[PDB]
Design a protein around this ligand. Structure first.
Ligand code: RET
Ligand code: HP6
Ligand code: HP6
Ligand code: HP6
Ligand code: HEX
Ligand code: HEX
Length: 227
């Protein structure tokens, strides 16, 4: 089919793959128990992204949805990725600052709601109702971010300096990167249809690699993950 976005799906496959392999090799060599947990979680993240990026490349996870008088291409496979990857990233953050079980449950619950409503949105046929689901999803996201910013940061300042400092970086990457997703969806093929699907994929590829491989590099190279 040779769809124009394929190139970025192919580069995302390769970046996710390499990052998975690198983290696996590095994880395999660690014996510290606490470090191992971070390695497992953090290797699985780009691994999942890899599979989803590869699938999309090979033309799975793509469906046509009718709205605004057109058949719009929607990659639902991203949601299958983010369903598991986003809460895993939150888990890494939560274990870093030793967050309470209840906070974790709430964050993972809110995250499910973000991704589930984002997907309903993406698949909705009434143009205006697409944006209602988008709004509910953005809300859930903002809850998350609030918690990371106000709750976790506060928790991190009881910890050793390298733990507080590593957390702040990861928190800052997370806030900046995550906050861009809803904007992309809004202006792109799922929303207003302004940014073309080729460029939108580029944007999501950049954000995904940054949010998983970038995040992962900073986390796993830090001294904070040793118990
Ligand atoms: C590795 C992938 C990451 C870190 C993906 C993050 C995705 C989000 C923060 C998605 C947020 C969305 C909304 C807030 C509303 C509309 C739909 C979503 C799912 C793109
Ligand atoms: C009301 C949402 C505010 C989010 C702040 C996150 C840094
Ligand atoms: C404090 C580190 C800055 C990250 C911002 C761009 C991801
Ligand atoms: C992080 C995005 C907040 C809502 C959309 C603003 C254009
Ligand atoms: C104490 C956390 C409650 C979680 C329900 C979403
Ligand atoms: C950031 C998107 C700009 C591409 C042209 C609509």
């Amino acid at each position: 089919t040779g769809r124009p976005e394929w190139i970025w799906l192919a580069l995302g496959t390769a970046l996710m793959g390499l990052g998975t392999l690198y983290f696996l090799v590095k994880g395999m060599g660690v014996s510290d128990p606490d470090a191992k947990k971070f390695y497992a979680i953090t290797t699985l993240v780009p691994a999942i992204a890899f599979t989803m990026y590869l699938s999309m490349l090979l033309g799975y996870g793509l469906t046509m949805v009718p709205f605004g008088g057109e058949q719009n291409p929607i990659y639902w496979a991203r949601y299958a990725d983010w369903l598991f990857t986003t809460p895993l990233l939150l888990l890494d953050l939560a274990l870093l600052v030793d967050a309470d079980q209840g906070t974790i449950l709430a964050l993972v619950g809110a995250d499910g709601i973000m991704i589930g409503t984002g997907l309903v949105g993406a698949l909705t046929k009434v143009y205006s109702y697409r944006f209602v689901w988008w709004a509910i999803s953005t809300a859930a996201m903002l809850y998350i971010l609030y918690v990371l910013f106000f709750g976790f940061t506060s928790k991190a300042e009881s910890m050793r300096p390298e733990v507080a400092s590593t957390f702040k970086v990861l928190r800052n990457v997370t806030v900046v990167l995550w906050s861009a997703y809803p904007v992309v969806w809004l202006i792109g093929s799922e929303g207003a249809g302004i940014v073309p699907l080729n460029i939108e994929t580029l944007l999501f590829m950049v954000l995904d690699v940054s949010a998983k491989v970038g995040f992962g590099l900073i986390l796993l190279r830090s001294r904070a993950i040793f118990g």
